[PDB]
Amino acid sequence: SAVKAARYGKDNVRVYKVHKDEKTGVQTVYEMTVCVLLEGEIETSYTKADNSVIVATDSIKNTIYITAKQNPVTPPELFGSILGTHFIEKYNHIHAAHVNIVCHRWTRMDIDGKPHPHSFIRDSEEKRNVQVDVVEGKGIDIKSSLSGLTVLKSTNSQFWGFLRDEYTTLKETWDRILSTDVDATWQWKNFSGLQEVRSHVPKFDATWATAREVTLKTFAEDNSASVQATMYKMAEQILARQQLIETVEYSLPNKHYFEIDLSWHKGLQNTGKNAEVFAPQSDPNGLIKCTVGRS
Amino acid sequence: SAVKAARYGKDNVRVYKVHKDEKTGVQTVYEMTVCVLLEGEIETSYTKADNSVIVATDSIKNTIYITAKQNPVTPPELFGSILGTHFIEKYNHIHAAHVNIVCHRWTRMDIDGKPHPHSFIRDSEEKRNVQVDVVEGKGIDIKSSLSGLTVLKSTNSQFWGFLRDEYTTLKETWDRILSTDVDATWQWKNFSGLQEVRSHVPKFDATWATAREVTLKTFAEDNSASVQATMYKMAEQILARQQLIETVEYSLPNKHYFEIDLSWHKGLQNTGKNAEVFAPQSDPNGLIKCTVGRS
Amino acid sequence: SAVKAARYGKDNVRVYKVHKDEKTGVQTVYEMTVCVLLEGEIETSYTKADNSVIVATDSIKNTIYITAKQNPVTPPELFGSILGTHFIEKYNHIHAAHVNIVCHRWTRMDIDGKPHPHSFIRDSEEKRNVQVDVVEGKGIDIKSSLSGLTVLKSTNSQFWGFLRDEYTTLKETWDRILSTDVDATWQWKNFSGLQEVRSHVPKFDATWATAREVTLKTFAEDNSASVQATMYKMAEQILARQQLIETVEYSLPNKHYFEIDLSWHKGLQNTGKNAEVFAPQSDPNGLIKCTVGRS
Amino acid sequence: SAVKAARYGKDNVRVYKVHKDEKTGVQTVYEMTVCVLLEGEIETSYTKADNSVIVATDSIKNTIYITAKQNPVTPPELFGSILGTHFIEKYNHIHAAHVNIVCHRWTRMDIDGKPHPHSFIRDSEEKRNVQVDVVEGKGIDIKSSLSGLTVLKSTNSQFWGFLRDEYTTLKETWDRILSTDVDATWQWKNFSGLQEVRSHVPKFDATWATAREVTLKTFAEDNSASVQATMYKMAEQILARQQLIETVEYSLPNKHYFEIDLSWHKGLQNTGKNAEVFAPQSDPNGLIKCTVGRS
Ligand SMILES: O=c1[nH]c(=O)c2nn[nH]c2[nH]1
Ligand SMILES: O=c1[nH]c(=O)c2nn[nH]c2[nH]1
Ligand SMILES: O=c1[nH]c(=O)c2nn[nH]c2[nH]1
Ligand SMILES: O=c1[nH]c(=O)c2nn[nH]c2[nH]1
Ligand SMILES: [Cl-]
């Protein structure tokens, strides 16, 4: 037998960093969860019990904190690229670093209509994520994403004209609830290294904001023919607004809300045009995915 | 042996309701999770296999949907009271109903600076809850709460002057991070029945809003001497603003963020006044509770 | 306003302890999660910012580790009682300690049909728990429990003869699936203090084992008329086998598995006597509780 | 823009099936969670709102139940292959089906030392999984796995001789606790279609059993030089015992248990040879992966 692939490192490293403006007294906090996995000439640790090739995962953890101390942690695309580059440059035998970062929301509180200098609220479990793969001699590949954005519209969703055969019981509909948890990923063109990533720094936050805005507006305004059709419209617009993105991927559950027939009870009318009370279904759920790239 | 206490019913009943304004086209959604447990002269179902006394839990589920169809579901204090009253009035042998409701956030989306008629976002896992106990001949007891409100302040929290003995290693501090998940409950004076609950309907939403506002403002503005001292200030203010509340209870975890000494690495300074990077601790956590009532 | 009730301490303290037999080389591990909350003359920490009355929660954490180092951690009833007694004896102004312990399973592995000296498996998320309340001048109250024991029987459960009215759609049945997660609690007679708890030490593990055995056998053998009837039989037997128990409480979800009518598809028969494929329902669920004491 | 990849279907479909032996009265239950995603000539549903190409996800759900009714559901490798083949054969424009199955444990209860005919216990959250990809003209690729197998050994694990530099604080050790949650996947050689999968049916359960046994024995018996070295030994043995496996992948967290220095308290000795009480760490954790194939 032979080692075909191997990677190892530290997962679930929670990091918080505060920035304090001495002039204004304003403080800004960042909190993330980081995973770093390394690859390289490490097969002998598996096959020969040769630990001399292992950068201990505890050391990887230390490196994450030290790197956060000495560098900006925002945008996460930049931080991930600095962190990944560190490992391939520092260690001759390490040839790839894979860095995943999940950014947690700490939103500045408004008290009496003004922004508070040092108090924050977690407004939702929505995350902003990055995956950065730094591969020696092959540059830096970055996938940025948002996840956990949960939305619902109560009308202006339809689903009719699908294939009907002997396995089909679903009725066509011209008015239904549509609700999903959005997972959207945009993949950047390959960057040659850290200098190039630095040169594009302003684009990272702007593109995240654009992706979020396009998702929300399209969802709210589309008279949706299906999840498939609506998500394609979102992806199309993101690609149009940022030329440095190569592909956009959406993965969307269709979280069903079922009508409840109450007619058995005193002829109560609660279906079709009369539907007011529905039963949200925890499972099963549709799952719809697509990856959109350029012609 | 004898049955000393017994209650039974249906838990985890998910309900969604939509209200459609025909005039304006504006739609408003409510989503809740409901639990109803009944008590009464039901001991023989346990001791003699006498099912004749059992209102099936499936029927309780049906009743929740039917009641939501025929009544407003907001404020949840009113809905819970209608639902609980139903069971004690409908069934001679049922003498208490215990209704718990968890309200999930569906916040209207703003698209291009205007409120959208029918699209909603889940902004945070914060809940608004009620517990309603309807007891035949003893009225209606209502406890209202908010939970899952997660906040952090990066300075203006202190903790010094605590007991020091041979079990103590904790250093006194004049500047630390304070972060918690707020669980706050206000208990209403007993109501004689549904007519009295109806008479106070406007107070329910207003008091929820006040409790939230007082919590957030006090947390942000208090130069906190301890979690204990800050939470007492919150409870005091809520009791002052609503005379129909008898007690306020807060239950607050102290979610610790630890300094990381980096001095072992090139004399890097990251403690005390130089602390910028911290390690959030998933566990253990302080847990601080208090119930405040009137003199 | 006044402080009506207050308690504070440390939650989610994870503890592992190993015992090493030097003679046989056999090692035995225990892992628990502990919560300790104190009450006493501590109101001034809330009302006057007087921290002098606070035993820091960090010190409580230290005390848990020190106590585990110097005492047996099994049975958990004994450990909880030692830990709770410590606080009320050590601190003049602390008058009650509330200790909750969750014991996690680490079951010795059998390799090649023999017990391994130092390797363990987590066989299920079933827990053994204790709640110990040590109140100065009022002794020690102990509630022991098992939770997270998930079982299913595929036949020999019935449910018919329940109340039918205009809210009822449920069909009577003489053969259904019954599945639940068992939560069972037995409450001990009050103990005068640690000496008395020590005197009964062998009864704690034996009663846990009896409670588990009675639960499993009764569930498997009862031709169940309802969850209510079956759970009463369990509680009755536990009370009969251990005179030092005052009450037994069961709390049982009824986790529903629904028939799926497939007759719309080529007349396929999958209901009643022909039912083979079912849809487990994640929610809602019945919830049935009872507390059984002595005549 | 263009659709580069697309797949859609139904996730989280819970299925239970019972087999009843009329002769012996013995009943056997299977419970699974199934996900089916399809690919094919479906781009127009995204780009042109053409639903005519969509097999509704609700129909996919129906198909899962119908298929379970008419076929064995064990071993899951066979069931997944039948289910996947169905879609590519039934629908001309569907060219790949991706089926994931998670099998939940329902273990027959022993009551009074004998196997009960119809009562079952969930002994642990360990799962047996399959991923089956059925691709028209390219056969059937099957990856089988076990996951959620949580183990701990209290000694006979070492970690020394790793790289030490200015980022390293970890001390070498010759005796530590090792605990992990095992995720192991074995990938079968490609099968030409359902006939070939049927021909190997007995190998599926046997190989699962072998993989489990090898994992447990190796973990318990290896005087481990590292997670890397121990996991390689496991993978090597599995490949040796089943020639129809091409690769074995392990993904193992290193769940840390830290010594607690108690010497600050009355010189109490709890480190090194004197370590008895440890603090399990919820995070961060090492994560070690490897894929082993044939020379
Ligand atoms: O077994 C281990 N492997 C590793 O790579 C490692 N790094 N720190 N501790 C460790 N233990
Ligand atoms: O065992 C049961 N008890 C109940 O109270 C009930 N209600 N619906 N189904 C039921 N099954
Ligand atoms: O605010 C606090 N209250 C407490 O009781 C405590 N104990 N340790 N740290 C603490 N912080
Ligand atoms: O938007 C939808 N897309 C689908 O593929 C589907 N299938 N059932 N319902 C559906 N809704
Ligand atoms: Cl769907």
Ligand SMILES: [Cl-]
């Ligand atoms: Cl605390």
Ligand SMILES: [Cl-]
């Ligand atoms: Cl029920």
Ligand SMILES: [Cl-]
């Ligand atoms: Cl590790």
Ligand code: NA
């Ligand atoms: Na390198």
Ligand code: NA
């Ligand atoms: Na009544």
Ligand code: NA
């Ligand atoms: Na005392």
Ligand code: NA
């Ligand atoms: Na096909």
